[PDB]
Swiss-Prot record, chain B:
Keywords tagged on the record: DNA integration, DNA recombination, DNA-binding, Hydrolase, Transferase, Viral genome excision, Viral genome integration, Virus entry into host cell
Name used for this protein in its record: Integrase
PROSITE patterns linked to this entry: CB, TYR_RECOMBINASE
GO biological process: DNA integration; DNA recombination; establishment of integrated proviral latency; provirus excision; symbiont entry into host cell; viral genome integration into host DNA
Complex formation: Homotetramer. Interacts (via N-terminus) with the excisionase (via C-terminus). Part of the excision complex made of the integrase tetramer, IHF, Fis and Xis.
EC number: 2.7.7.-, 3.1.-.-
Record note on what altering E47A does: Complete loss of interaction with the integrase
Curated annotation (Swiss-Prot), chain D:
Record keyword DNA-binding present: yes
Name of the protein in its database record: Excisionase
Signal sequence bounds: none
Swiss-Prot/TrEMBL keywords: DNA recombination, DNA-binding, Viral genome excision
Whole-protein coverage range: 1 to 55 of 72
The organism of origin for this protein: Escherichia phage lambda (Bacteriophage lambda)
Assembly description: Interacts (via C-terminus) with the integrase (via N-terminus). Part of the excision complex made of the integrase tetramer, IHF, Fis and Xis.
MF GO annotations: DNA binding; identical protein binding
Gene this chain is encoded by: xis
Example GO BP: provirus excision
Swiss-Prot record, chain E:
GO terms of biological process kind: DNA recombination; provirus excision
Name of the protein this chain belongs to: Excisionase
Tagged with keyword Mitochondrion: no
Parent sequence residues shown: 1 to 53 of 72
Keywords per UniProt: DNA recombination, DNA-binding, Viral genome excision
Biological function: Part of the excision complex necessary for the excision of prophage from the host genome by site-specific recombination at the att site.
Subunit structure: Interacts (via C-terminus) with the integrase (via N-terminus). Part of the excision complex made of the integrase tetramer, IHF, Fis and Xis.
Species this chain originates from: Escherichia phage lambda (Bacteriophage lambda)
Gene transcribed to yield this protein: xis
GO molecular function per UniProt: DNA binding; identical protein binding
Amino acid sequence: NSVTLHSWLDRYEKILASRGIKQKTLINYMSKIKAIRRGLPDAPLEDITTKEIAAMLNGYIDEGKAASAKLIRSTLSDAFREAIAEGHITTNHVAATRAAKSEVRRSRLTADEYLKIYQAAESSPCWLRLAMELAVVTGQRVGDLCEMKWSDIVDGYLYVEQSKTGVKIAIPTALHIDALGISMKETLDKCKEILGGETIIASTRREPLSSGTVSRYFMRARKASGLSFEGDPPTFHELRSLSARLYEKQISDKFAQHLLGHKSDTEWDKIEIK
Amino acid sequence: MGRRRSHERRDLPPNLYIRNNGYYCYRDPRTGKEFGLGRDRRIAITEAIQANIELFSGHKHKPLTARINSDNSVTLHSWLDRYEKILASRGIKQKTLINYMSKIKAIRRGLPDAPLEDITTKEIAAMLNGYIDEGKAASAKLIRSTLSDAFREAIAEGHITTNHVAATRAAKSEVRRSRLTADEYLKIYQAAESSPCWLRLAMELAVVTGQRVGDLCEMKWSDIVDGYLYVEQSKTGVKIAIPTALHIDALGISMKETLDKCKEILGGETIIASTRREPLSSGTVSRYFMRARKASGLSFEGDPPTFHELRSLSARLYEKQISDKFAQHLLGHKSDTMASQYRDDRGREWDKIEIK
Amino acid sequence: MYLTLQEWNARQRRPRSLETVRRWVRESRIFPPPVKDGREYLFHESAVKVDLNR
Amino acid sequence: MYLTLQEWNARQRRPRSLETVRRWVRESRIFPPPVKDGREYLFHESAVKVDLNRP
Amino acid sequence: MYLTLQEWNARQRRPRSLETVRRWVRESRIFPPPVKDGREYLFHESAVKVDLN
DNA sequence: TTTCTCGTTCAGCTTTAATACAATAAGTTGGAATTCTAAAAAAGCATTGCTTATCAATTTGTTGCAACGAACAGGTCACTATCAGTCAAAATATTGAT
């Protein structure tokens, strides 16, 4: 015999542990499995009906967390699909449901807003301002900005190894944003004088900092400025979105794509005469 | 019967017996005859025991944790034989049909002889994953796809009602075929001196035309008219005309200059012929290209490039040379999905960004 | 995956004496045979009993 | 890739003694046979003990 | 995983004689039915004495 | 003494990019086996007085090895009785009509 839902979810986690994926990634799925535990009773898989699955799913959709429902529904479905592979059951009662379409409500950042936040970051340490200008001049993600060492800079270049995708690019130390008044070179040297550490962005103790504190302190200066938005207040990651939006009208669109680390393509167009 | 049990079969499998000469012979449930196989005991029984993989002859089966659902039917190893009779009527090129047979053969020595509604999804995964642990991931994907379409056609003929293979996932390859730069190009062409002369000419001709090695050995001196190079790809079927005015400065190779070299040194009916003035195969051209690769001494990360990689290097060069739309029509490729998945680097060269 | 004579007898419908386990091997009552590797048989992960009679 | 005397025995179904493995090498109970290199023996990746006896 | 004839009857409320229990086997009065190992019968831990008629 | 001060991991959430699904058509890469071909080795070329083999006709000791007579497989057909398979025997359950 040996059935039951929970018993399977325990033998399912080990399966994903051999899939060979990122660390943080494996953790994301685990958090989804635990939610299913306290979301559905402990009984054989062949007993679980599609109704109970949608009863728990919609429960997270009404609470406002529609995005979470999508992942939990997409993860719970994979468990059953791998369960059938073992010969446990015969059908996937999760493929009968429908994922709730969620729309991104995280507002973007403009030029005026950024200037209002940078000045409000005065009460904050002396590395936040540097992290802001750097994240906008390089347009890189907060994750790699913390793993940047002064050894990466080679003859006027900036070797950056993206952790997320894995793309490898080299941003020259000649860039400059013509809208806020920031220069790549002047920004880097400003970090070598003020900060002074092994990494371009360090702490007051001359030591590397986590990527969870760089955007954390940025939030404090966000609510301290006193700016209202529509939806969810922008974050530190938005500096990356603002970076490209500026470089597209400062140089070229093909430049913003190469700066971010993209390869493929994927508002108010103009109707030319021809 | 006359002889139900005996003191000789007492140490022998159901099939196979022993004569008065101490010899053993295995019966045949198709005529009632037998062939002499073995002089020893633990050998004839250890031989007449794997054909004995199918005592259905009593015994049934059951793993750890499972359900029940069956009745009666027929074999299945035979279905793999009837499936081949259906694929030969689907009108397929003489090269793709062979690709399927090789896979079906792997399914033969993979899954046990068994009815069709017996082979559970778990059994198919045990064989599938077996090829993954060996590294052959790209193979498990084709074996699964083929074994999947086999059952699909089976259900459409009143034999099965489900497709257990659709339950299991397919491996995801990563393509570990390293690319070839322009610098490593000259390094190979320089070591191609020990090899025949047609190699270097077809090596440059394969980078100046950016054509396939297969169609590269199909071009004749009659396909050139008014300065054009009419080439008919066999893989897709696209038809293009390559101008004899092309040129690659990154390597210093002129189109017309390379063509003439194959008219004097080589000579023959085909642009690229052998020393015997005869057309070569598409497997011999890329064959000798390997020799110059290993003799070079250069090292890569993963799997060494190939002669087909020249087609890729040709596209990357023409890109910066003239334009992007130019290295798209020449390769006889359309759409807008591979044009980008053929310009990448795949962990080799850094994508440097310039002020432009 | 191959197991020993002791580990194999532990994963059966009913564990018997080691003596009886050795007997089955000698009498060839298991598909496939253990194959002596040195001085200790090595059962296959799928090697199950068959049992004969007269 | 060639494994050593210890490395090879550390990958078998049942790890034995170093002196024991040395005995097989002398009894040709190792197919294929290891190669002499320096002072130790180098076995093959797919090297597995066999029984050169037919009772 | 299974239980011997004695180990199964000893757990019962009214442990009957060996013969009587062996008779409920040939009369299929025990479901799930027991399997014969070599000389003894190994029932299931949940096997009960289904008395019908 | 007592208070000022920062980085982490946890957990319930939200967002950013690549890979989709399948049948179709080859391409690659380590050898295997037949046949062309230059590379090697044995032999012909070259020749003459002197050394060694050529062989009958018939008696006597010697020996390789086919010619057979049994025994141990080597391979196919028959002994001896009911498996192996499918239809009818024998009368009413179950179903259809009064």
